[PDB]
Amino acid sequence: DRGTRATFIDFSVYNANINLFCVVRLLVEFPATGGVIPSWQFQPLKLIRYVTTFDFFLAACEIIFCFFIFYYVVEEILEIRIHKLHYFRSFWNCLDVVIVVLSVVAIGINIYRTSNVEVLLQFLEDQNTFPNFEHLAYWQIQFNNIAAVTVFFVWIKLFKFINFNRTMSQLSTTMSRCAKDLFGFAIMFFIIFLAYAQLAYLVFGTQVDDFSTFQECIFTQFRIILGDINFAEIEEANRVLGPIYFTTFVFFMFFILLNMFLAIINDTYSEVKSDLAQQKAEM
Amino acid sequence: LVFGTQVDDFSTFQECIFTQFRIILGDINFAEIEEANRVLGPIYFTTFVFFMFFILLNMFLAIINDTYSEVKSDLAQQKAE
Amino acid sequence: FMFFILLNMFLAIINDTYSEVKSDLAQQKAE
Amino acid sequence: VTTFDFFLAACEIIFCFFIFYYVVEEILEIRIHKLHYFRSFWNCLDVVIV
Amino acid sequence: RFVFPEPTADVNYIVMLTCAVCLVTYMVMAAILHKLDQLDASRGRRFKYEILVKTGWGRGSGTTAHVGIMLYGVDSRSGHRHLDGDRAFHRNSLDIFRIATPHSLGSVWKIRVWHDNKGLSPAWFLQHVIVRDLQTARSAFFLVNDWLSVETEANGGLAALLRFRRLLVAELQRGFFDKHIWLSIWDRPPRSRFTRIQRATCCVLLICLFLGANAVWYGAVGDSAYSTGHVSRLSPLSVDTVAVGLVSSVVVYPVYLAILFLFRMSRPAWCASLAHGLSLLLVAVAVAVSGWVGASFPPGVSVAWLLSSSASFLASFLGWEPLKVLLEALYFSLVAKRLHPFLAKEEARKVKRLHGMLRSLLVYMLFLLVTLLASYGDASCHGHAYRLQSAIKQELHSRAFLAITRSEELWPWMAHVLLPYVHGNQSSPELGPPRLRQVRLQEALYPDPPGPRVHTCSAAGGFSTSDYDVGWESPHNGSGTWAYSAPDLLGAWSWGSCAVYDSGGYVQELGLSLEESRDRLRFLQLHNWLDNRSRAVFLELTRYSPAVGLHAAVTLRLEFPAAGRALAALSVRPFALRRLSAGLSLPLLTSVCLLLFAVHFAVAEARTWHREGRWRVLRLGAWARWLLVALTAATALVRLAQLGAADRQWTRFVRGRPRRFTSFDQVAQLSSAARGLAASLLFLLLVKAAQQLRFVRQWSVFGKTLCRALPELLGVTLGLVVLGVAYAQLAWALRLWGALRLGAVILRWRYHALRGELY
Ligand SMILES: C[C@@H](CO)CCC[C@@H](C)[C@H]1CC[C@H]2[C@@H]3[C@@H](O)C=C4C[C@@H](O)CC[C@]4(C)[C@H]3CC[C@]12C
């Protein structure tokens, strides 16, 4: 009727060749102002893991991973308590806590979800009723979103281990020393970035649909920085404040603001190399 | 890990590398990155542009800018020596 | 090799030309 | 009739404001500052341009 | 007599923005007070002429004594050091009183002193401070100047049995701006232990508690007086909002008195460091509960809550704190009746600058809050506006309309897609019949040579204004059947392609129901209503969505650059019809608050204009101030004009709804402009927030290296523009030139020079 606001369609499939369930959800939304908005979600779950030897291999690697994270958390508690307190001015220890927290969250989610499979058993009792696999897909998505960030930080941590000669050491020194002062300009640049974002959201955020939301405005500005979006629709959106905004943004934040980042890095590297070269006139 | 199932541009592993290289040339689509994962996708896109076009691509130029000046100074001094 | 190692030598050349012009002008006007 | 000639009109208005700024600035260089001193070839252009 | 509503999820941004502003201002003010307190901590151990008490009245005084001196008088009070002399207070050991006492009022009773020694002493009594008029002349060099003893009665002007009046007046004069918490973050007496910073914690605690209590009472207590709701008009009755503000302040006051008592007299060994923690909890909790109770405010009580909070703050500042200091003075006077309540002189200008910055920060934060409200008060019916306009554009088949060139398919288009859209079973309630105002020109056009268009449209002339008949011109008996329908002065300027149009022309009502409207459409089609010159067509009717509460002005335009060809353009502008007579809606309050700020800036500008005199021109600051004032005034006036025009149009409509049009379009224009201007104004403020980042020693260079290289950047831009005009005078480019990264080298050089010159 005219009163409806949302419609869902749900089902799932097995594809017995490989061992991967696939749950399918289709949403259709009816805004009160008229129109239709579709959305879809296909999720490849896996619930019957232990069949082949590779599955036991993966389980063993999971156990070893739990042992490793337990080892790291123990050696971190030992270091925080039985050694220097408030050792947070390093950025190399504030990274370990993030990694261990993300890992323990992932393990907790896995224990919560994997141990919760009785719905499959209920479906296997009688197979003429709708299976309820929606929660499992959501938790699988959440687990993937955590593992994908955990692996990123684990890879990032490797930078601590590359100082095996003069060149890498000096590059690391330049990169670290150039972070204390780039922080201020980053803040001052993001303030103007958000000022442009809110201005665009308030002005064009009603007829363009690229500026229809604040984060969408931020993404549009980043795309313009990459050089992807053209203002061929902004004039239709607005003829007074359109070209003015576009020109001001592409001039002030692409010819002036974006070069201080180059200048600071260039000067820091130059002074660092000069200092390290002068470190040989004394020896 | 995030987009390796539904975009089709990050299906394999080397495909991700080639897609990032195309992004460096400014050939992003972003019509599927944002709808494949509304959170953690735009985060990746935004943090990828800020750490490449602003920081990590201004370091090659710094080295090439400093070394050129240094070598010209040394060579000119040697010529005038 | 086209965007990272070969494009930036052009910018380095421009930068060095500007710096040399600046230094020469400063030396001449401060002599 | 266009969306570019209006920018030209705005530039003309800005130009008129600049000429007002330079004419309100030159009278003080003759009244308060010592007058009848144009043998500089620089105060000469400033007035003829205006 | 309580309720846990949790009705909806649509957050109310007003409370969130207010809380965010109140915490940000506290953070920055605490940051400033950190240095303002470190200076006092370092200084832990003219006002008048050089005080001199160098005398030799006594001998054999090899002991020590303390001679305290108090410079009484309004707005000036400070103690003095001990009775240390040139020979350790021994025989004839008295020096000039060259102690730093910058507190000294005018020709008032600035005289008070006392002495405390190890019991008694010989006849060593320094006469007085012989300072008549050398620097400021706060008093004369004449007093009793004779033998004295401990607790000297150093009274004066420019047993004491009446201890009552003297004790009360002294205690009030000392504590009228110290105990008073609000304006004490500026006048803390030195050597005290109340730390100059937790004074800000008390203030932020009061603000957050006021906000929380008011947010609870509004929308959490509607049983005892059920006076709230639909029967409660948001307009301030001046009998109710003040009452709830007062009662909220009174009920929340005791916990403040408890936390202050835990602060004062704490060094109780170290409990003060606990108290901060408590505050950092309570305010948060307060904010939290606001963020839970304010999410379900009806759209009219939000202004009432702000008024109640303002009244509550103004109540605890206009008598409650004075009452507390008065009762404290009486308690002290009636309990224990205590009788005593270029090297290193550059810091004075530093303290003055810090006080000025602290005073300007509050005004900046208040202006930021009011402009944030003016901008995002209704930042919830904003995505709905986009969805509504997109839906309207979609169901009108905008693509099918923007791809018509001949002036013949317009009739099938209207008969097929538009008329079924206007009428139907329910079919998108309209609120207004359509119109077909139309212009003729009278300057008959001729088709261009083969080809769509050579450069542009041309051959314009004088728009026709005469009367005509069925078919065209034939006025025989009386008034023409197709009158001109003279344009209104409000609502015009569509700004098409060929020229700038207006609201004048020959109109058609287009009937009421589908059958009659279609028949009349065909009737006027066959009788040659639209085949002649007929520059424009101007189809535009209405739209209104009750579900969200937004109207939409829809305008369709076909234009004729030449006889035979057309150009299509449509505009759907959504807005919210908020009348001026609706009470004290938030936009009206923000508009009347912005005018006060504009007046304040104008007054502050004129007070310096006339102080320095004329010829203050040629300074960028004056121009910036006079442009900011103009922008603020324009924003306020445009918003007020939109509010007035909405009411005018709505009254005109409700007058003759059945067969009128009333053209709400102008309102949709103003609501746009009043939303653009503010959007720019806030922008400026944000930019300012970047510049004031320079108050960091490390980050002060990022502004200097950009203000120093401005001439070079302008020169480079000049080169760009001259090469660009040359590129066209011989008859890409910008891309290759901008790929040079030219500004980078100038910025790098300036940065290197500034860093080198920083050490
Ligand atoms: C006083 C000093 C500090 O100690 C500041 C230095 C300012 C200076 C570098 C700036 C000021 C005006 C600029 C020129 C412009 O006016 C038109 C042009 C024409 C174009 O074909 C090439 C470029 C050129 C020459 C510009 C060159 C750079 C200039 C000379």
Swiss-Prot record, chain A:
Superkingdom, natural source: Eukaryota
Impact upon substituting residue 269 to A: Abolishes increased channel activity due to a gain of function mutation
Transmembrane segments: 54-74, 91-111, 138-158, 183-204, 240-260
Binding residues for cholesterol: 142
Intramembrane sequence windows: 217-231
Reported tissue expression: Detected in fetal and adult kidney. Detected at the thick ascending limb of the loop of Henle, at distal tubules, including the distal convoluted tubule and cortical collecting tubules, with weak staining of the collecting duct. Detected on placenta syncytiotrophoblasts (at protein level). Strongly expressed in ovary, fetal and adult kidney, testis, and small intestine. Not detected in peripheral leukocytes.
Outcome of substituting residue 189 to P: Gain-of-function mutation resulting in increased channel activity. Absence of gain of function. Increased channel activity
Extracellular side: 112-137, 205-216, 232-239
Outcome after substituting residue 189 to A/I: No effect on channel activation
Effect in UniProt of substituting residue 223 to C: Abolishes increased channel activity due to a gain of function mutation. Reduces but do not abolish ion channel function. Abolishes the Ca(2+) permeability and alters its monovalent cation selectivity
Effect annotated for changing residue 273 to A: Abolishes increased channel activity due to a gain of function mutation
Subcellular location field: Cell projection, Cilium membrane; Endoplasmic reticulum membrane; Cell membrane; Basolateral cell membrane
Binding site for Ca(2+) 1: 226
Membrane-side (Cytoplasmic) residue stretches: 75-90, 159-182
Motif (Selectivity filter): 226-228
Family: Belongs to the polycystin family.
Name this protein carries in UniProt: Polycystin-2
Organism: Homo sapiens
Full-protein residues shown: 416 to 698 of 968
Swiss-Prot record, chain B:
Outcome reported for the amino acid change (mutating residue 61 to A): Constitutive active channel. Reduces but do not abolish ion channel function. Reduces but do not abolish ion channel function
Effect ascribed to mutating residue 68 to A: Abolishes increased channel activity due to a gain of function mutation
Intramembrane extents: 16-30
Effect of residue 16 to R: In PKD2; Abolishes increased channel activity due to a gain of function mutation. Abolishes increased channel activity due to a gain of function mutation
Tissue distribution of the protein: Detected in fetal and adult kidney. Detected at the thick ascending limb of the loop of Henle, at distal tubules, including the distal convoluted tubule and cortical collecting tubules, with weak staining of the collecting duct. Detected on placenta syncytiotrophoblasts (at protein level). Strongly expressed in ovary, fetal and adult kidney, testis, and small intestine. Not detected in peripheral leukocytes.
Sequence motif Selectivity filter, residues: 25-27
Family in the record: Belongs to the polycystin family.
Subunit description: Homotetramer. Component of the heterotetrameric polycystin channel complex with PKD1; the tetramer contains one PKD1 chain and three PKD2 chains. Isoform 1 interacts with PKD1 while isoform 3 does not. Interacts with PKD1L1; probably forms a Ca(2+) channel. Interacts with CD2AP. Interacts with HAX1. Interacts with NEK8. Part of a complex containing AKAP5, ADCY5, ADCY6 and PDE4C. Interacts (via C-terminus) with TRPV4 (via C-terminus).
UniProtKB/Swiss-Prot annotation, chain C:
Effect of residue 22 to A: Abolishes increased channel activity due to a gain of function mutation
Subunit structure: Homotetramer. Component of the heterotetrameric polycystin channel complex with PKD1; the tetramer contains one PKD1 chain and three PKD2 chains. Isoform 1 interacts with PKD1 while isoform 3 does not. Interacts with PKD1L1; probably forms a Ca(2+) channel. Interacts with CD2AP. Interacts with HAX1. Interacts with NEK8. Part of a complex containing AKAP5, ADCY5, ADCY6 and PDE4C. Interacts (via C-terminus) with TRPV4 (via C-terminus).
Expression tissues: Detected in fetal and adult kidney. Detected at the thick ascending limb of the loop of Henle, at distal tubules, including the distal convoluted tubule and cortical collecting tubules, with weak staining of the collecting duct. Detected on placenta syncytiotrophoblasts (at protein level). Strongly expressed in ovary, fetal and adult kidney, testis, and small intestine. Not detected in peripheral leukocytes.
Signal peptide boundaries: none
Location within or outside the cell: Cell projection, Cilium membrane; Endoplasmic reticulum membrane; Cell membrane; Basolateral cell membrane
Family stated for the protein in its record: Belongs to the polycystin family.
Gene: PKD2
Effect of residue 15 to A: Constitutive active channel. Reduces but do not abolish ion channel function. Reduces but do not abolish ion channel function
Name of the featured protein: Polycystin-2
Swiss-Prot record, chain E:
Protein family: Belongs to the polycystin family.
Reported modifications of this chain: N-glycosylated.
Disease affiliated with this protein: Polycystic kidney disease 1 with or without polycystic liver disease: An autosomal dominant disorder characterized by renal cysts, liver cysts and intracranial aneurysm. Clinical variability is due to differences in the rate of loss of glomerular filtration, the age of reaching end-stage renal disease and the occurrence of hypertension, symptomatic extrarenal cysts, and subarachnoid hemorrhage from intracranial 'berry' aneurysm.
Known function: Component of a heteromeric calcium-permeable ion channel formed by PKD1 and PKD2 that is activated by interaction between PKD1 and a Wnt family member, such as WNT3A and WNT9B. Both PKD1 and PKD2 are required for channel activity. Involved in renal tubulogenesis. Involved in fluid-flow mechanosensation by the primary cilium in renal epithelium. Acts as a regulator of cilium length, together with PKD2. The dynamic control of cilium length is essential in the regulation of mechanotransductive signaling.
Superkingdom of the source species: Eukaryota
Extracellular compartment segments: 218-242, 298-299, 374-588, 644-671
Outcome (variant: residue 204 to I): In PKD1; uncertain significance
Protein name as catalogued: Polycystin-1
Species name: Homo sapiens (Human)
Organism lineage string: Eukaryota, Metazoa, Chordata, Craniata, Vertebrata
Phenotypic consequence of residue 641 to P: In PKD1; uncertain significance
Reported effect, residue 319 to S: In PKD1; uncertain significance
Gene name linked to the record: PKD1
Topology, Cytoplasmic side: 34-196, 610-622, 693-714
Limits of the PLAT domain: 47-158
